[PDB]
Structures are given as structure tokens and as C-alpha cells.
Amino acid sequence: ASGRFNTNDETKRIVWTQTAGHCELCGTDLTFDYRAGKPMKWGEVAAILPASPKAHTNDTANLMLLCPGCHDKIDRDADGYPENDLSGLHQAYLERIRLAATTPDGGRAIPLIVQSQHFQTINDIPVRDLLTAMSAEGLTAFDQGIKIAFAAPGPRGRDTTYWQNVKDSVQYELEQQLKRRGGTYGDSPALAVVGLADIPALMMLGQSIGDRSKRLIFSFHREHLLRWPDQSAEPPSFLFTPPPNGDGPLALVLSISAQVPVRDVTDALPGARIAELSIPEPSYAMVQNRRVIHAFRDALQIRLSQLEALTPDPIHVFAAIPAALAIEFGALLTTQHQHTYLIFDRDKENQDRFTQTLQLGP
Amino acid sequence: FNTNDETKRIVWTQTAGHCELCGTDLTFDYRAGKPMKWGEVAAILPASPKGPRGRADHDAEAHTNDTANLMLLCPGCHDKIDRDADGYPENDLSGLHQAYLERIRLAATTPDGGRAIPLIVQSQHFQTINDIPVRDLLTAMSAEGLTAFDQGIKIAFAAPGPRGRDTTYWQNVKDSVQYELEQQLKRRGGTYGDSPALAVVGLADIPALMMLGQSIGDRSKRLIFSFHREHLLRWPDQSAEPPSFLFTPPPNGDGPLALVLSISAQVPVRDVTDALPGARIAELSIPEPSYAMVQNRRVIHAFRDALQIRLSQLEALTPDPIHVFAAIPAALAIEFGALLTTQHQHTYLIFDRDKENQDRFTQTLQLGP
Amino acid sequence: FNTNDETKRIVWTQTAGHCELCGTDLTFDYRAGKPMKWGEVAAILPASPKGPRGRADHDAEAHTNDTANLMLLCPGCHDKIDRDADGYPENDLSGLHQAYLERIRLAATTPDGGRAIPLIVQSQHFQTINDIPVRDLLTAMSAEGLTAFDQGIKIAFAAPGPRGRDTTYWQNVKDSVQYELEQQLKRRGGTYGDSPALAVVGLADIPALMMLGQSIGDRSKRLIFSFHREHLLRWPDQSAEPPSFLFTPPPNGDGPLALVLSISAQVPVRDVTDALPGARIAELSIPEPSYAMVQNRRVIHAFRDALQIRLSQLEALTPDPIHVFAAIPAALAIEFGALLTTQHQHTYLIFDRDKENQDRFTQTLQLGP
Amino acid sequence: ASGRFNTNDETKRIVWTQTAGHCELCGTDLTFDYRAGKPMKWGEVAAILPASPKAHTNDTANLMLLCPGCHDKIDRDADGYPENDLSGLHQAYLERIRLAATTPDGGRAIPLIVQSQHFQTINDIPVRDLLTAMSAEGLTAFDQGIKIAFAAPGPRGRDTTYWQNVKDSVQYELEQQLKRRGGTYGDSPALAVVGLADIPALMMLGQSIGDRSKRLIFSFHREHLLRWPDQSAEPPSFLFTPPPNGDGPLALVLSISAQVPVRDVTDALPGARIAELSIPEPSYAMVQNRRVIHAFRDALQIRLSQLEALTPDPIHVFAAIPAALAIEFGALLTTQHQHTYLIFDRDKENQDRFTQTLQLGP
DNA sequence: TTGCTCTCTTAAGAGAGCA
DNA sequence: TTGCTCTCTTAAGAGAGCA
Ligand SMILES: Nc1nc2c(ncn2[C@@H]2O[C@@H]3COP(=O)(O)O[C@@H]4[C@H](O)[C@@H](COP(=O)(O)O[C@H]3[C@H]2O)O[C@H]4n2cnc3c(N)ncnc32)c(=O)[nH]1
Ligand SMILES: Nc1nc2c(ncn2[C@@H]2O[C@@H]3COP(=O)(O)O[C@@H]4[C@H](O)[C@@H](COP(=O)(O)O[C@H]3[C@H]2O)O[C@H]4n2cnc3c(N)ncnc32)c(=O)[nH]1
Numbered sequence A, D: 001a002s003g004r005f006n007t008n009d010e011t012k013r014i015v016w017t018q019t020a021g022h023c024e025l026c027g028t029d030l031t032f033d034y035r036a037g038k039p040m041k042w043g044e045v046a047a048i049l050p051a052s053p054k055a056h057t058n059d060t061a062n063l064m065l066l067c068p069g070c071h072d073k074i075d076r077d078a079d080g081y082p083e084n085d086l087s088g089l090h091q092a093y094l095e096r097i098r099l100a101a102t103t104p105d106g107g108r109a110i111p112l113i114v115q116s117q118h119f120q121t122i123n124d125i126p127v128r129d130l131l132t133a134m135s136a137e138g139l140t141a142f143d144q145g146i147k148i149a150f151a152a153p154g155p156r157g158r159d160t161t162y163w164q165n166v167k168d169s170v171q172y173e174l175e176q177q178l179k180r181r182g183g184t185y186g187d188s189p190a191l192a193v194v195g196l197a198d199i200p201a202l203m204m205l206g207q208s209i210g211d212r213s214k215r216l217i218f219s220f221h222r223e224h225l226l227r228w229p230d231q232s233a234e235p236p237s238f239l240f241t242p243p244p245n246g247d248g249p250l251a252l253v254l255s256i257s258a259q260v261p262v263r264d265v266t267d268a269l270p271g272a273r274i275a276e277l278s279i280p281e282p283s284y285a286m287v288q289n290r291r292v293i294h295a296f297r298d299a300l301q302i303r304l305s306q307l308e309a310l311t312p313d314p315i316h317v318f319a320a321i322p323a324a325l326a327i328e329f330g331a332l333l334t335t336q337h338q339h340t341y342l343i344f345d346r347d348k349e350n351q352d353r354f355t356q357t358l359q360l361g362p
Numbered sequence B, C: 001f002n003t004n005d006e007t008k009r010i011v012w013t014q015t016a017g018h019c020e021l022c023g024t025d026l027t028f029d030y031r032a033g034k035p036m037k038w039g040e041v042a043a044i045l046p047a048s049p050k051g052p053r054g055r056a057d058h059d060a061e062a063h064t065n066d067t068a069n070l071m072l073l074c075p076g077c078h079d080k081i082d083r084d085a086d087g088y089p090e091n092d093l094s095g096l097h098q099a100y101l102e103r104i105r106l107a108a109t110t111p112d113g114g115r116a117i118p119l120i121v122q123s124q125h126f127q128t129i130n131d132i133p134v135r136d137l138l139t140a141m142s143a144e145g146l147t148a149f150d151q152g153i154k155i156a157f158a159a160p161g162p163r164g165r166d167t168t169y170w171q172n173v174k175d176s177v178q179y180e181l182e183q184q185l186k187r188r189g190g191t192y193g194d195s196p197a198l199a200v201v202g203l204a205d206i207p208a209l210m211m212l213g214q215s216i217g218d219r220s221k222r223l224i225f226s227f228h229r230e231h232l233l234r235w236p237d238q239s240a241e242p243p244s245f246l247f248t249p250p251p252n253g254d255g256p257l258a259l260v261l262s263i264s265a266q267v268p269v270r271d272v273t274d275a276l277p278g279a280r281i282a283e284l285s286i287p288e289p290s291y292a293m294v295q296n297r298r299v300i301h302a303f304r305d306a307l308q309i310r311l312s313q314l315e316a317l318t319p320d321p322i323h324v325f326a327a328i329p330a331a332l333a334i335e336f337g338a339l340l341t342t343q344h345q346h347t348y349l350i351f352d353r354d355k356e357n358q359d360r361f362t363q364t365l366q367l368g369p
Numbered sequence E, F: 001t002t003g004c005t006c007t008c009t010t011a012a013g014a015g016a017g018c019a
């Protein structure tokens, strides 16, 4: 349409970069020639047009990149300016490109390693291993990682005070690091967390971090370490057997890492009515990727909704589950609603007898 | 063995002139104000096989101008990846490169979808951090073609005090929804015009989110978004078919009418009748209650349609208030509120789980006229 | 013409291995976890006279190892100053260089002064942004030798609602001072030990800051800091002599006893008697009321001593409450509160300016037993 | 004392850098030899000692730099480890060095230029000029500056609605940019602001920004532009003449840029009782540095405390003051306390007649 | 078993005949 | 009046005789 707008080569380079080399009206990639091995004729495969009718109309930011076909459908005056205003559409297009181009700063993250004193001695997880696993997924620490070890219990054992001090220790550290807002919008950083400790302690870590913020669990794997064994693996089916009817105490057995024998459960809890969540082939190596953790939580909560409806009384939990799953179990039970859960764990200093160690509830 | 000028121009173009590893803008110096191209076109596999990530089986000449091997980096990111090859291996750099490039391509091919005011409303009544990232809402908006003129509004309720969610707490929630939000929309009004749509995501007390919905319904157009435990602000599955919303009508009687919503979880009847003796329970539910069920916005719209039907039926049964006991996702709480704006002008008394009374349901806010 | 290794080692040493223009740590890569020296020793005046800031009268060889011409910079800051010489001229770069070096030298020669918990308490009752920077408190602490194990506690009151500073507002202020703060000190307790001192700075409602002082007095040791309109958290003048705190005793009578504090400004009597008819006014003042008068902590201590005297005298005059009308700096409001902890256990009724009643003084909080 | 701890050269370089090359117990600069032209003997002028008695005792971060004199007063075992723990003192010393080394990120800042439509046309202030003035003082923008121009008034004039829309426009922009927290501690950025507009509008900008945050005013100077004329200049004395006694309206004349004639004040305000704040030599060029602005505010508030005490009635303001001073005047009057001020300004389209244009108050 | 001199590597702008 | 080839500049690590 009538005239054409003139641009020097420097202006062309600027407009091509801020648009990512696509037509702003149809989205066609105007670098097709290069992708094909043909030389780029930058000034032939694109037209540059001011977005507004004819004193910043020529400022680079108010200049548009269009393919020739879309440029030909634009009515223009003898100077190459549009007759109708496309400023809104153009500024919107630039905004979508910037949001995508700035997405890497959405990775700002706090590293957090939590261990028992025992696994810290036998199987220390250094910050370096968490950082490289974080980096490969786009999660970017900006300061020193938090590396915590759960305090050893005194004579009173792991009583309510012990567990409340654990939760305060973890949350004090997290909140200080979650004040370190940054990036394009001032968002709090993401949390990148790995745990290796007894299952009740790991559930208390889940109680501490919750599941209502940008948070990514990582997992320590005997063979693959902090790297995910297989990003393309599909989560397994989580099989459920419902509890028999009766008045005995309700028990939830989680047979994920291994098959828990019923006799060990009824030894610790006489009269137990066992409901069980299992997978077809229990294995210590089952946490192939993060989706497995998400799938476990989804299946678990579906069944806890059924079990909590069955009775007002506590649900007694006997879990053989991987560490990353134990954290997600704790984080799931952080709504306002609180059913009473009594967590049993095997005491390795008392011939692996299931022992009640933790209570979650109102 | 140098990268030619056409290829460097392509690298700058397909990355939009930002660092692929940290997102900083490399086309301008914001400190002193001069346009400048201060990035570096960086090689993943080096020319020298002795360099970082060096390999003997790498034909350097066959890849000098291969943009699969060339990243736009700030000088600092570039200096670090060349000093720590084991920490920044080829396969990890290549995957981040391809992922960065694909996000830009998808933004460039997304058609304009209009404008909206981003609105985040979140509570502090959990015993854990609760925080919706702004970037993630803006990104979900952008995936649908929606842009905004600023990063929008973010309201965080004051936390409960030493007495829990008491009368003062709920006064404060009201003031946040009915005064603070309105004052911030007024200020930003003008930039967005006469009737700007609100792109809204909530994660807050269920009675609060119902009050928000009522307040924003009608007054403004609305595009609902949802926070999801696995997918955050991204819709889990745009192809998922909504579930069936099963309704159970109340028994006949003179007892108080209760509307139970069992969507996130099965609400036990014993807990309703303990709070409201003689309750005549009507229930909306899905076949498999689950926290994860908000798969796409069509799920939200199907809930609305199913409940709009049932609410008019229940208000006919009696002129006395309807008592709500709801285990529902946060986005559905907002939609429930929006149904009560001007049409369903019956009094609704909202019950909620009370951590100060052993998880019993107690009465919180009254909605309606 | 290259900088020798000894001089580069000096540059890295005197800058503590951080970028002199942006403060980033250049001794470590936090993303992937490897110690690495990723900075650059940069020349202000270049070797080539054609380069950025180039000059013909610069003997490059006489300055190759002159640390007055050499800055430790990140690669990005370095790349920008070399691309915009007019935006980053020699005289501006040299001044920032010398200022960076002198701050490090002063920190290194500051003797250890102990530990303290940083505590910021601020309101939202102004019609403008109100925000005390954390860095500035930590820096004032460090100038006195005080360090902390974390950046400390920062409490921001909820803003007034649509009814102004009503009963709900003051309940919330109380909960912030008496529950939120105590819960955060409990959590951080253990790291700081049995009796950790609080390095406290307030900028909040005068009655709130008095309530804070009462709550923190005795319970904990205290190092008071002050926000100043010109100097921020830095003491304006450590050599300034405190002013004389002039006291005017109340007239004899049976009327209500009023304590007027005219330190920031002269409180008009008409405004006291309008709020409290029959008031018998005692007044503490300085010769020249001014918002700027908190020149150093000795000024604060002199106010405390002057007022401790007068408060015991006034409580003897009558067992009925003392009515406070105060135009005082925020740090003195905190100290007033601390005097009322366990010693002055008389009832004090705090009046404040009310924007909802045309700037009249109205009653707010009651302090005491 | 007995043994000595051994370090390789790489460890020495790390310890010297994290301590800034000073003795951690006495603060002596151990780079004295270099400053004198003598070669550095790094291993002779300093000793490196673990801070804690004898498994991170040898980690670089737990290693101390001491001068030989202070090292000799440390009792050590045969391995060179201290017998008493200096970990607390050492970690404190490192913390003070880091706080100083990170001080440049305390400069993160939002640029803000505010102008009238008139001065935007006649004397546009580009962002570049503000940025370079910011940069020279250590203030560092991270995104595009805000550049606002006050809306022209409609038929109703600059009424209360006009002025409330100004204040909302300014505060909306500021607060969005003050969400861009960052740096070491998550602080909101500093505001760097320059105004060039009519004095009432500039006072409304001061009402919008306040004086209770990290904020630095800049000033446009006819000769020196946005750069300060003279950083070493001492502020002038601000002379005050008190108002005569009577019942007429109270007027505050500010004769800073120029001497305001009394007849112009009494023409606009019959019966005016004039109090005046002036300097010895009024001049358009008087804003030599930022301390001048601070000094003006301190002197002004001292006198406003006197005048507001004199009468409950409004104070009528007739100001010939520089633009930067007009902003600080507006920001001063943002406490909870509010006396009524009526601002008169010369109407350049009505032969420069002083005209009441703005009211500040409860 | 540094711990000084000189070569090497990687990025960039500059400019020189020509398009 | 780019708009490809080759030289130039600035930083760094590497390593080679020697300390
Ligand atoms: N076989 C079996 N195991 C049972 C039974 N009843 C309970 N369990 C417990 O389940 C866990 C299974 O081992 P895991 O490696 O899959 O998960 C553990 C667990 O989450 C956490 C703490 O260890 P532990 O107390 O031994 O719990 C073990 C078992 O007692 O950390 C995980 N963990 C432990 N070591 C590692 C490691 N090297 N790598 C990764 N994760 C680890 C029952 O009947 N049978
Ligand atoms: N399981 C269960 N929950 C019940 C029962 N009776 C009442 N409830 C309440 O329903 C909500 C279910 O959690 P949700 O995540 O599906 O939805 C909540 C809700 O819309 C809002 C506020 O949370 P809350 O007050 O805890 O209400 C919770 C429960 O108390 O926000 C949603 N929400 C909370 N956490 C998240 C999260 N991490 N991600 C997304 N949305 C969230 C009953 O019997 N059983």
C-alpha cells in the first residue's frame, strides 16, 4: 500500500532481535531460508513498519517486523507509515517475547538438603550434587545452600516438643531464604529440596515445606544419585485393597519400596484392619522421575479421602516408601483440615519393631 | 573456524537478545542507558579438544556455524560454564538451549488473545509458606494470548492472630477483598479502560474465596486460573473431559438445609450433623474426589453449570439460610461466590474446618443480601 | 605492559573478591557449586589511547601495576564500561573505586562489637510508601562492630481499613507486637542464645512504638537505632551534644493530667484542651523542636533520663491516668514505652492525631497494668 | 605457640581474599609492603590458622588470617590448631567484610522523571541524563526508567479530583516498581527522582513519594544539568522573619530562588501577615548539592512548627523556590498530622498573578 | 615437591576492498 | 552512500626454566 518505510542495517538488526525473527501478525518464522541452508536476505523476507500512524513513531521499540504478505494487507501512506494504529497488538507481541526470554530468571532457587545424623555420616549428600541436578533443570542458586541435620533426640525421645523444634528449625531457615526475592517481578525464590532421614522425620520436613509454593523435590537414588533415573518413565499403577470391616484400629500400609508383612503390623497394633496402597513390583529404585512422586500423592489423597470418611478415629500408618515419597506425604497433610494420623516406624535398635513415633493432627 | 556474521545474527535473533542461562537483556545497559550488544555467542562443544567439554570426535569445522552448538550468553554465564565443564556438561547445556529456543518460538506463534488485569489473592492461614509466583500467572496468561500492562495486583491476607480465625480475622479478610482490592483496581483503572477483565487465581480460605467471587462477579469480566500441586499455574490437561457432578437432593423436613460439596474430598456426614443438628443434606460430588481434579477451565465451567442448576432448586425449598460445608478446590470456591452475586440472592452461611475446635466445622462468613 | 601477578593478587585482596560496581561474589559459582575466580582485573584508563577513556597524556607503562587504575569487575560490568565510555567516565569510575576500597578497609579495621538480632518494625498508616531497608540497619550495626546470624526480623503492620485506625486496626497492631514478634523471636531463639540483644529500629504509629517499647523493655537487652530523613540509618553526628529537655510542671487542680511531649514539633495547647477539657498540662520540650534532632544514641539516652525523672513526679500527683499527647521521633517513642515496663506501672492513655476527625487528638491505646 | 599450620599457595590466596588482607584480631593491613613499593612476601607477613580447635576445621572458610604478632599470642597444639575457639570472632569478621563487599547492590534503583507538558516540550529531561547522574553516585537501574508527564487540566481546572488523579498516577507507577525487590536481602529498590513542573505539581509529587524510604532527589540545573554543581558547597543560612501580629490571614513567603515582592502577596491575599524564609543571596542556581535540599527541609520544618502553633487557621504559601526544593516541601507534609496549607502559584497566563491552586490538609 | 616469562585460547570491534 | 576477510585489542589459563 503506497509508500515504504526505510531502515538502515543497524535498525533492522534491532527489530529482528526484539521480535525473535517472526512476523508479528501471523507468527511465521522469517529465518526459514537460514534453516534450509539458503543465504539470508534479511531485507527481502521481511518488511519493517512503524506500528503507529505518523515523535517516537520511528523509535526502534515502535517499529514492527512483518512478512511481505502481511505487509501488503496494511494500508500505508506515501511515507510507509500505517494508516491504522497497530501499537496495541505490537506492544502485546513484544511483551510475550520478553516474558519467554526472561523465563530463565524464573529459576532462582534455594538449595535445601536435610539429613539424619546417621545418613549424614553414612551417605552424605554434598551441596555440589544437588546444585548440578538443579542446574540441569534450570534451577539457579544465588547463595550458599542450606544443609541441615536433624538434632539427635535427648532422653525424652522424639516427643511433641522435639517435633515442634524440628519444624521451627526448618521453617526459620526457609523463611529467611524466601525473603530473598528477585528476578523480573520480585518473586520469592523456588525451593529445591532433598531429604535422607527416617520416614517420620521426612514427613515432618513435608509438614514444614508444604505444597503451596514453587517447590521441586529431588531424590537420592542408589544408582543414579541426585539425577533422575529416567525422565520418560511412566508412573506405576498404585493398587489399593480396602480395609476389612470391624471395630479394630484402622491401619494404612504403604508397600511401595517393599512388601510389608501383615504380622509385623498386627504385632505392633493388635486388631489392625489393614488397608494397603502398593505398586505391582515394589522396589527401592521406583522413583524414576518427579512425576512418580506427583502420581503417588494423587493416588494417596484419593484413598485418604475414602479412609478419613470411614471413621473419626486415627489412621495408623505403616510405610515402606522411598524418602522423596515420605516428604510428599507430610506436605499433603498441611491443609486447614486435619485428620489424626499416628505414624509407626521400625526401630532399628529394637529388632526393627514398628513403633509409634509421630502424631499429625488438629 | 570462526562463526560468520550471518550465524551470529541468527543466534541473536532466535534468542531475542537475552542470556539463555539467566534471562538478562543483552541489548541494553540499564545502568547508564545506552543500547549495546553486550552478549557473547558461545560454543557448547569447543573448537580446541582441550577446552571445556572438549572431545576428540568433534569436527570443529563442520560445526562452526551450527546454531545447535551456539548459545547467546552474558559474559558472566559464559565465563562460568568455561571454568566448570563437569558442572555444565554438553548434554545439560544442549537441553537448556533447546528448551529456551522452543519457549521463544511458542511465544512468537501465539496469536494475540487480548488484555487482562493479573490478580493473585492468597491467605496466610496455613502453617506453611503460601505463595503464588507472579511469573507463573503471567506465563499462563501468555500461553492463552493474554497480556497485561503491568504485573497486576497481589493481595496477601494478614495471618491469623493468637486467637485463630476470630471475628477480627474475618473483618480483615473482608477489608482485603472489599476495600484493598477495590482501591487497587481504581488506581490501575484508566490504563486498562472501562471494563477490563481480571485474570484471577486464588489460594486462600474457602469462605474468603467465595466472598472474592461474589465481589468480582458481574462488576467485572473474569478469566479464572488455578494453582495446581503438580502443574502450578499451567492447566494439567487441556483435553481432559470434565467429570460428572453427581447431586443428591435433600430429604424432606423442617430441619436446617445443608449444601455439602464433596469435590476435593468426601465430607463425612457425621461432621455436618455435629455442627448442625437436624441437618437435611443435599450434596454435589464427583465419582472420585481428588485435590487434582481441576484439569482445565472447562472443568471449572462444568462445576458452575451443575451448581447453578442445583442452587435455584434448593432456594425454592425454603426461605431460611443455606448452610455450606465444602471440600472444594480454590478455583471452584471463587466460582461458587460468583454465582451468588445478583441471581442467587438467598442467605448462605459458610461453615469451615476450625483448627481451634479440633477440626470441627464452625460458622464463618455470611454471604448474600 | 601487562599487570604482573603480585598486583592482580593485590586487586583481588583489597576488593575481597567482589565486583566493585555490582557487589557480586567473584570467588564462587553458586549455580553449580565450584570455587572459581571468575572476575577480571580491569583498567580505568586503557593501554591503547584509542580505547574507552583513552587519553594521549596517559603513560600506560608507568601505570600497568597502579591499583588506583585497576578495578575488580565481573565480566558483564567490565564489558559495559568498555562499550560506553561517556556513560562511565574516568572520574566517576575512580570515585566509585576509591569509595568501594575505603568501605572494605573500614570494615576490616572495625573491632568486634558483639552480636544482636536485627529488628525492623514499620507501619502502613501513612499515605506514602514506608519501608526501612534491611541493608541499612545491618550496615549501621556493622559500623558499631555488631553482627547477626541472619538478616533478622521485619514486621510491617497491616494497613488501616476503610474505617481508618479503628478498634480492629489497634487489635491488629497489638497482635503484631505481642504475638507475631514473640513467635519470630522464639523460632530464632537458640541460634542467638539465652539473652540476645535486639538492634531495633521503628517507623510506625507513635502509640504502637510505645507498645513495642513496653513489650521489649526488660524482657530483652536493647540497642536502639533510628531512621533519619537525611541520613537514613546512619547516625547524623556522633559528636553532637544532646539538647536540654525543658520541663514545665502541671498546674494544681482536679482536672485530668496531660503529658505533652513537644520534641519533633510544638504541640498546640488548644489541641490538647479540645480533646481533654480541663487538662492540666505538664510539658517536656526542647528549645528548637525539629524532626531532625536524633543526632546520635546519646540524644536518645538523654531523653530517657529526662523523662524517667518527670514520669515518677507526675504519677505521684494523682492515681488517675496520665494522658499523653506526643510529637516525638520514632526512636524516642520506643524509649518512652520501655520506661513503662515494670517501674512506671501507672495507667497511660495515649492520644494521637486522627485523620478521620480533622487532625484532632483522639484516644488510641491504653498502656500500663 | 608450639606447631604451625601448613597451607599451599592456592589456600593462601583464598584466605587473603576473604579477609581483605587484614589481621582478623587487630585489623592491621597486611599489604603494607606492597603499598610501600617493597615486594610482597605473602607467607612471611601473615600466618594462616584454623579458627577452631582440632571435619571442616581446614575448610577455607574456617581458616583465619593473622599478623605474626597476633599469631604469637595464640596458644596452639603441635599441629598448628588453636587450643581455644575463635570461630565466633572469625565468622563475625568475615560477615563484616561481606556486608561491605556487597554494598554496591544496595544501589538498585528506579529512575523517575516527572515533568509538566510545558517543560517536557521546552526542556525535556531524557532518561540517559538521569541514569549517568545516578550511576556516578552508585545508583543502578535494572529496567526502563519511569518518565511521566502531568496531565493537562480540563475545563474544571486543577480541582481536588485532578490532584487526586495525579497522586494515584504517580503512586500506581511507583508501587509496581517497588515490588521489584532484589539484592542480598530482598530490599525494595531505591527511588531516584527528578521533577521539572509548576511548583504545586512538584509539591504533589512530594506528597506522592514521601520521605520514609530510600529515595534520592536529583535536580535539573541550568548550567550543570542533572549533575550537582559542587559536592563540597556548604548549605546557606535560611533567614526567617516572623509574621506580624493580628487577625489577617497567615502567609508564608519562601524567597529562595528570588525575592518575592510583598505587594504581589497582599494583592492576592488581602490582609496577609507575612512570615518569610529566605537565604542571604536568592538565586536560581542555589541547589549546589543534595545537602542543600536537606538543609532547606530542616529549616523549613523548624519554622512550620512555630507557625502551625500560632493559629488553627490555614497557612497560605507563596513560594519562589527551586524545583527540587518544591518536591521536598510536599514530601515533608506527609505525616499523620496535617495542618491546612493553601498553595498560591503565579498564573503565567494571567500576568503572573498569585492564584490559589492547591490545598493540603486532613 | 611458586611457587616469572611467554605462548595460547576465546571472544569482540575495526576497517579495507568490494558488493 | 553492507552493508566479507583479516588485523587488532583485552582478558584469561598453561606451562617451562628456574627459584
Ligand atoms: N524392606 C522393607 N522396608 C520397610 C519395611 N517397613 C518399613 N520399611 C522402611 O522403608 C524404607 C525402604 O528403604 P528406601 O531406601 O526405599 O527408603 C528409605 C526411607 O524412605 C528413608 C529411611 O530409611 P529406612 O529407615 O531404612 O526405611 C526403609 C525401611 O526401614 O530413607 C530411604 N533410604 C534409606 N537408605 C537409602 C539409600 N541408600 N538411598 C536412598 N534412599 C534411602 C518392610 O517391611 N520392609
Ligand atoms: N481433605 C479434606 N479437606 C476438607 C474437608 N473439609 C473441608 N476441607 C477443606 O477443603 C480444602 C481441600 O484442599 P484443596 O487444596 O482441594 O482446596 C483448598 C481450598 O480451596 C483453599 C483453602 O485451603 P484449606 O482451607 O486447607 O481447605 C481445604 C480443606 O481444609 O485452597 C485450596 N488449597 C489448599 N492448599 C492448596 C494447594 N497446595 N494447592 C492448591 N490449592 C490448595 C475434608 O473432610 N477433607
Ligand SMILES: Nc1nc2c(ncn2[C@@H]2O[C@@H]3COP(=O)(O)O[C@@H]4[C@H](O)[C@@H](COP(=O)(O)O[C@H]3[C@H]2O)O[C@H]4n2cnc3c(N)ncnc32)c(=O)[nH]1
Pocket (backbone or CB within 6 Å): C203, C204, C205, C206, C227, C228, C229, C264, C265, C266, C267, C268, C290, C291, C326, C327, C328, C329, C330, C331, C333, C353, D211, D212, D213, D305, D334, D335, D336, D337
Ligand atoms: N508536626 C507535628 N507532628 C505532630 C503533632 N502532633 C502529633 N504529631 C506527630 O508527631 C510525629 C512527628 O513526625 P516525626 O517524623 O518526628 O516522628 C514520627 C513518629 O515518631 C512516627 C509516626 O509518624 P506520625 O504518626 O506521622 O507522627 C508524626 C506526627 O503526626 O514515625 C516518625 N516518622 C514519620 N515519618 C518519618 C520519617 N520520614 N522519617 C523518620 N521518622 C518518621 C503536631 O502538632 N505537629
Ligand SMILES: Nc1nc2c(ncn2[C@@H]2O[C@@H]3COP(=O)(O)O[C@@H]4[C@H](O)[C@@H](COP(=O)(O)O[C@H]3[C@H]2O)O[C@H]4n2cnc3c(N)ncnc32)c(=O)[nH]1
Pocket (backbone or CB within 6 Å): D123, D196, D197, D198, D199, D220, D221, D222, D257, D258, D259, D260, D261, D283, D284, D319, D320, D321, D322, D323, D324, D326, D346
Ligand atoms: N523570580 C521570581 N520567581 C517567582 C516569584 N514568585 C514565584 N516565583 C517562581 O519561582 C520559580 C523560580 O524559578 P526556578 O527556576 O528557581 O524554580 C522553578 C520552579 O521550581 C519550577 C516551575 O517554574 P516556575 O513556574 O517558572 O517557577 C519560578 C517562578 O515562577 O521549576 C523550576 N524551574 C523552571 N525552569 C527551570 C529551569 N530551566 N531549570 C531549573 N529549574 C527550573 C517571584 O516573585 N519572582
Ligand SMILES: [Zn+2]
Pocket (backbone or CB within 6 Å): A023, A024, A025, A026, A027, A028, A066, A067, A068, A069, A070, A071
Ligand atoms: Zn505475516
Ligand SMILES: [Zn+2]
Pocket (backbone or CB within 6 Å): B019, B020, B021, B022, B023, B024, B073, B074, B075, B076, B077, B078
Ligand atoms: Zn547470563
Ligand SMILES: [Zn+2]
Pocket (backbone or CB within 6 Å): C019, C020, C021, C022, C023, C024, C073, C074, C075, C076, C077, C078
Ligand atoms: Zn559487576
Ligand SMILES: [Zn+2]
Pocket (backbone or CB within 6 Å): D023, D024, D025, D026, D027, D028, D066, D067, D068, D069, D070, D071
Ligand atoms: Zn594482628
